[PDB]
């Protein structure tokens, strides 16, 4: 009550920088590394499930989130800002898309919509920018597979592969010299597993690593049968047994 | 009731009766159906007594505020369009008004607007309004000359109201007369239809089918 901050909290400095956006960006850099890779037939996004205390619970720490049955997201930076952003994201996919066209938004559109929410926080009265960057991976029918990065400025760009947070510069360099445009989904997973290794300081197993694929339709994950025109979600979060299983490489 | 206004070479003659009825009951024979908006503008009262008397007084307030801001006499056009526009905002709410806004400016000459609660606004030379209107029109229509004298114009307006006071059950009491010049208006008295009928009958030879 009596929210009197109707003036903007992000202004232009005389140098021409938007301070709060730079600082938010900075908070992202110090965040745990996460990465994405686009293969021919799928996308993988990955991050580190850095447990604070070993008394904390691994599953409880989700950093990889379904947005749409064909769209996943992951982040680096301030986790609460992300959780919030995920829920606005899911709601907007329904509210400005599913409830109007009867289908889920294409991946770029959902992205420009998260971008919109973020931009407003760099301009609306009384707020600070979000302290996160997201990688968002999806598949719609007309654009196929895609992978985007969205920053606290509201800017976003499509990537063949990228990474954000602490080990981003090393990861990006390593990714650059392993990415070709003929990777299967499976290959790109292996590469993602490699690139994560360098950035992960300590223990490196299926319970300290999170992984998602945006891939084939899983009619096993639909929950119902009888409408052949309705296939499963393309999004799939890998199991710790699944990660560990191919960690033998 | 019966109210009339018409313009001629000498300005505007305004004539009205003064009877108010509720049902069959004559509530008053003494109502002022001419509203003196300001020394240069007259309005007439028909339909709702309160609606005319109220908003035309309010009109007088708006006319003064105009003269203070703009340092000049408000045009009869502008005065009437204020009344009209107001009324039109209330359309459907049940206001009842039928009225001539009358004035004489240098820019316009003698000018009459008819304005009603339907949102109607009409410039014209002769108007009659009310239950007695159809009688007064007949007298007016067959005697109106643009070049009527002032004495004669005053008569014609008076005789037209008498005509309607006689035949219409809802008009009567007395006639109130006005002359509107460019210098403003002049009241020309209140004449009881009682006395006036007999004088007119005797001196004019009309109303032959009445025993007197």
């Amino acid at each position: 009550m009596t929210d009197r901050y109707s003036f903007s909290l992000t202004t232009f400095s005389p140098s021409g920088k938007l301070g709060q956006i730079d600082y938010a960006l900075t908070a992202v850099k110090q965040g745990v590394t996460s990465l994405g890779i686009k293969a021919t037939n799928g996308v993988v996004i990955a991050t580190e499930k850095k447990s604070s205390s070993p008394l904390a619970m691994s599953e409880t720490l989700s950093k990889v989130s379904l947005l749409t049955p064909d769209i996943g997201a992951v982040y680096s930076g301030m986790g609460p800002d992300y959780r919030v952003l995920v829920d606005k994201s899911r709601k907007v996919a329904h509210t400005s898309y599913k409830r109007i066209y009867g289908e889920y938004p294409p991946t770029k559109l959902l992205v420009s919509e998260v971008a919109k929410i973020m931009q407003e926080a760099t301009q609306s009265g009384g707020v600070r920018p979000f302290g996160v960057s997201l990688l968002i991976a999806g598949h719609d029918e007309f654009n196929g597979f895609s992978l985007y990065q969205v920053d606290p400025s509201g800017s976003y760009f499509p990537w063949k592969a990228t990474a954000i947070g602490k080990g981003s510069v090393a990861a990006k360099t390593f990714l650059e010299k392993r990415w070709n445009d003929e990777l299967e989904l499976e290959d790109a997973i292996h590469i993602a597993l490699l690139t994560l290794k360098e950035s992960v300081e300590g223990e490196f197993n299926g319970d300290t690593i999170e992984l998602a694929i945006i891939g084939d339709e899983n009619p096993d994950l639909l929950g119902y049968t009888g409408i052949p025109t309705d296939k499963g979600p393309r999004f799939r979060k890998l199991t710790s047994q699944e990660i560990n299983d191919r960690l033998e490489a | 009731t019966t109210t009339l206004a018409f313009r001629f070479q000498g300005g505007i003659i305004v004539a009205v009766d003064s009877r108010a009825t509720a049902g069959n009951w004559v509530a008053s024979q003494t109502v002022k159906r001419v509203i003196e908006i300001n020394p240069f503008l007259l309005g007439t009262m028909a339909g709702g007594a309160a609606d005319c008397q109220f908003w035309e007084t309010w009109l007088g307030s708006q006319c003064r505020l105009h003269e203070l801001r703009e340092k000049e006499r408000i045009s009869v056009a502008a005065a009437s369009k204020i009344l009209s526009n107001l009324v039109y905002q209330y359309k459907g709410a049940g206001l009842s008004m039928g009225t001539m806004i009358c004035g004489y400016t240098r820019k316009e000459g003698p000018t009459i607007y008819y304005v009603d609660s339907d949102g109607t606004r009409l410039k014209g030379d002769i108007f009659c309004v009310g239950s007695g209107q159809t009688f007064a029109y007949g007298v007016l229509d067959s005697n109106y000359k643009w070049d009527l004298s002032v004495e004669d114009a005053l008569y014609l307006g008076k005789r037209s109201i008498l005509a309607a006071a006689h035949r219409d059950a809802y008009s009567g009491g007395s006639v109130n007369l006005y002359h509107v010049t460019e210098d403003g208006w002049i009241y020309h008295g209140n004449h009881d239809v009682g006395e006036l009928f007999w004088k007119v009958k005797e001196e004019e030879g009309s109303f032959n089918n009445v025993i007197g």
Binding site: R4 | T57, W58, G60, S61, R64, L65, L68, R69
Partner: protein, 242 residues
């Protein structure tokens, strides 16, 4: 920094106080109240000789029995004058009579102090106090001829004569000498002309000062140049005499 409605340690409203400063920067206006009427004069004070001297309006009519003189930021006074005009007319609509000079002035003053940034009560919608002051002259049947000074402090005082703007104290001191209870109206005119000529930067003439009066008989009239020019001459001869 600090609020637009804060108190100084001496218990004064900064913004109000700073507004009185802008006012002393304004062209001079003087009023004198006689028993044959009230006179108001203002120093037009034109910026350039290309400016049309007629277009300077510092004495305005509020109702037929109420006149106004202004000094300060004169753009600020437009809306006050509007509210005063609306008030005198509204009162006449509601009561079929002329509003008292006192009450009209009290209504203008209410309009001041209505400033701030969210003072919890209703709506104090106005960023800053008015930077202009008024001499409100009038007649009514209860209190005869009357002169008022309306400040941006929402305060108002009744004077028998009062000057505001550039060289008020100069003028006021001169008024304090020349004013007595039995001044004629024609005297008060020459008197306003005198005291204006002292304190005006330029030399006095019908083109750079303007005079007005409010009389019971004729209400509020602003004098024309030819009318005023003649009173200048009347004073010039009066003053070449021991």
């Amino acid at each position: 920094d600090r609020g637009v409605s804060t108190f100084s340690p001496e218990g004064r409203l900064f913004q109000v106080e700073y507004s009185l400063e802008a006012i002393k920067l304004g062209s001079t206006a003087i009023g004198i109240a006689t028993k044959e009427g009230v006179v108001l004069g203002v120093e037009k004070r034109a910026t350039s000789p290309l400016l049309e001297s007629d277009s300077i309006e510092k004495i305005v009519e509020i109702d037929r029995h109420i006149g106004c003189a202004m000094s300060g930021l004169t753009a600020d006074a437009r809306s006050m004058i509007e509210h005063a005009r609306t008030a005198a007319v509204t009162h006449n609509l509601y009561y079929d009579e002329d509003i008292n000079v006192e009450s009209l002035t009290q209504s203008v003053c209410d309009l001041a102090l209505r400033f701030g940034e969210g003072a919890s009560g209703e709506e104090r919608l106005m960023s800053r106090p008015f930077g202009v002051a008024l001499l409100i002259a009038g007649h009514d049947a209860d209190d005869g001829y009357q002169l008022f000074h309306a400040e941006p402090s929402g305060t108002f005082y009744r004077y028998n004569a009062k000057a505001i703007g550039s060289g008020s104290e100069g003028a006021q001191a001169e008024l304090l000498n020349e004013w007595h209870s039995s001044l004629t109206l024609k005297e008060a005119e020459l008197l306003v002309l005198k005291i204006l000529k002292q304190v005006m930067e330029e030399k006095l003439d019908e083109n750079n000062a303007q005079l007005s009066c409010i009389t019971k008989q004729d209400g509020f009239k602003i004098y024309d140049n030819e009318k005023t020019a003649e009173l200048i001459k009347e004073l010039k001869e009066k003053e070449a005499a021991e």
